[PDB]
């Protein structure tokens, strides 16, 4: 089962802040018109490959990440299980931590861990009826930097009339976003897609003649 | 603050297992360092040892290790020689503070401390940052003699023996590289 | 942390002993060296390696095919086997840890030790 993701999964990738001109950076991102992965038994553990776009529309409570989880190695279980969120990576305990929870709406995420970090974006757009993945342009803001490091692999999403969910893998993609007057990003054009698409990402523009 | 401890510690770890501990979030005044008779080489690349207390930098690195008298001048950027090639790579770019100081009060027994090993031989050339702690056989020679351990094949890991007797060139010198990146 | 051995003693060629290295303290991983043989006067020599998490038999060509090693998780000890003992495998034996306190991925904190001291004495 494969839908088809419009253009969404762009976080801002930097932590500067700009304002109305084309920045041009390169890192991973979702691709464009990228086959996404319907899940409507409901949660097969999956690899990782440096990054995956988590997108649900409360039903969901969190994800468990590691590499084979048993009491052998160092889990990741992020749950939404109080009033506020919390994160263990025991299995033992070497860190934890506590924060504002993360908990129709849209809910994404898209996870990453490069070098020791681990980050993670979020947003919370509303929809109503079902364009399974919409349509419109809408970034992502980070929520933590968790310099913790362990080698994952593998990730499991928590759970408790069949769910939604879908997972997209990442890829190392240039973009081109398009920041706003205010500081937001409004949209943004790949610079690998489509041979009208490479032409925007080497006249600096959104128009070509 | 914090970097009291990895200086004046009773042991150091040895070059293969070479010690990272990192510091974070507090003042680093660095008014201890740069003026002290005990040190002996300190020789910063990238930055100057001086204007360091007026800089801010983060995720700073503090490895540790300790090695002979003639192997201080193999932590330098480059510089091939036999523990850069396998043990210990600084890389290229490396914008930090190798302290290579003097210790023979403190690591050498009456018949020879054995405590701080090193790695002789190895297959693998080694990556900027890797640790190579496995402790597998080298196969010295095209030789199928694997499990004899006898010759045409070595066990890694060996010795260095520190005797107060000994000369200038082989006296251990508890190094410490204070490593930091933006 | 310290390190514990046994077997020890003074025993006629061609019997057979233990020999025992035990571990206590605070660690994590406890990734063995090995077992180290040193003749009176002489180097100490690498007669049983190959302990880490994938690893082979490693044994001296001068006593291939005679004494074994085990991996011992529950203290995170080793058994090293004696048999058909021999006056040439005289030695005062020693055992190599390499500890670990490093539960973070990062900071490796992990000195290097040794133990103390196996008194072997065998003769015909």
């Known amino acids: 089962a494969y839908t088809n993701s419009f253009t969404r999964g762009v976080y801002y990738p930097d932590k500067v802040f700009r304002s109305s001109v084309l920045h041009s950076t390169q890192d991973l991102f979702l691709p464009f018109f990228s086959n996404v992965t319907w899940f409507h038994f409901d949660n097969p553990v999956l690899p990782f490959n440096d990054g995956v776009y988590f997108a649900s529309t409360n039903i969901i409570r969190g994800w468990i990440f590691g590499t084979t989880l048993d009491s052998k190695t160092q889990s990741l279980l992020i749950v939404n299980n109080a009033t506020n969120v919390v994160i263990k990576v025991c299995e033992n305990c070497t860190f934890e931590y506590v924060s504002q929870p993360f908990l129709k709406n849209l809910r994404e995420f898209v996870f990453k861990n490069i070098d020791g970090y681990f980050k993670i974006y979020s947003k919370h757009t509303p929809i109503n009826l079902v364009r399974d993945l919409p349509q419109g342009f809408s970034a992502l803001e980070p929520l933590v930097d968790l310099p913790i490091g362990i080698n994952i692999t593998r990730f499991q999403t928590l759970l408790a009339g069949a769910a939604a969910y879908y997972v997209g893998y990442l890829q190392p993609r240039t973009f081109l976003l398009k920041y706003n007057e205010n500081g937001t990003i409004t949209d943004a054009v790949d610079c690998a897609l489509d041979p009208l698409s490479e032409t925007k990402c080497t006249l600096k523009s959104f128009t070509v003649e | 603050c914090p970097f009291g401890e990895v200086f004046n510690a009773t042991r150091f770890a040895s070059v293969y297992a070479w010690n990272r501990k990192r510091i974070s979030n507090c003042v680093a005044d660095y008014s201890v360092l740069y003026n002290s008779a005990s040190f002996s080489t300190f020789k910063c690349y990238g930055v100057s040892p001086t204007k360091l207390n007026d800089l801010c930098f983060t995720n700073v690195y503090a490895d540790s290790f300790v090695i002979r008298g003639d192997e201080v001048r193999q932590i330098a950027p480059g510089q091939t020689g036999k523990i850069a090639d396998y043990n210990y790579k600084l890389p290229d770019d490396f914008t930090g503070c190798v302290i290579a100081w003097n210790s023979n009060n403190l690591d050498s027994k009456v018949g020879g401390n054995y405590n701080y090993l090193y790695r002789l031989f190895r297959k693998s050339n080694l990556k900027p940052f890797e640790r190579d702690i496995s402790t597998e056989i080298y196969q010295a020679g095209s030789t199928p003699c694997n499990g004899v351990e006898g010759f045409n094949c070595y066990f890694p890991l060996q010795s260095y023996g520190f005797q107060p007797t000994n000369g200038v060139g082989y006296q251990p010198y508890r190094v410490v590289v204070l490593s930091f990146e933006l | 942390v310290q390190l514990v051995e046994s077997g020890g003693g003074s025993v006629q060629a061609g019997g057979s002993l233990r020999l025992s290295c035990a571990a206590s303290?605070?660690?994590?991983?406890?990734?063995?060296l090995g077992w180290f043989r040193q003749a009176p006067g002489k180097e100490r020599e690498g007669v049983a390696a190959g302990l880490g998490a994938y690893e082979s038999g490693y044994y001296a060509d001068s006593v291939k095919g005679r004494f074994t090693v085990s991996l011992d998780n529950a203290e995170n000890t080793v058994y090293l086997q004696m048999n058909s003992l021999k006056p040439e495998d005289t030695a005062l034996y020693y055992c190599?840890?390499?500890?670990?306190?490093?539960?973070?991925?990062?900071?490796?904190?992990?000195?290097?030790?040794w133990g103390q001291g196996t008194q072997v004495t065998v003769s015909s």
């Open positions: 190599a840890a390499l500890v670990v306190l490093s539960r973070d991925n990062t900071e490796f904190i992990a000195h290097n030790y």
């Open positions: 303290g605070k660690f994590s991983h406890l990734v063995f």
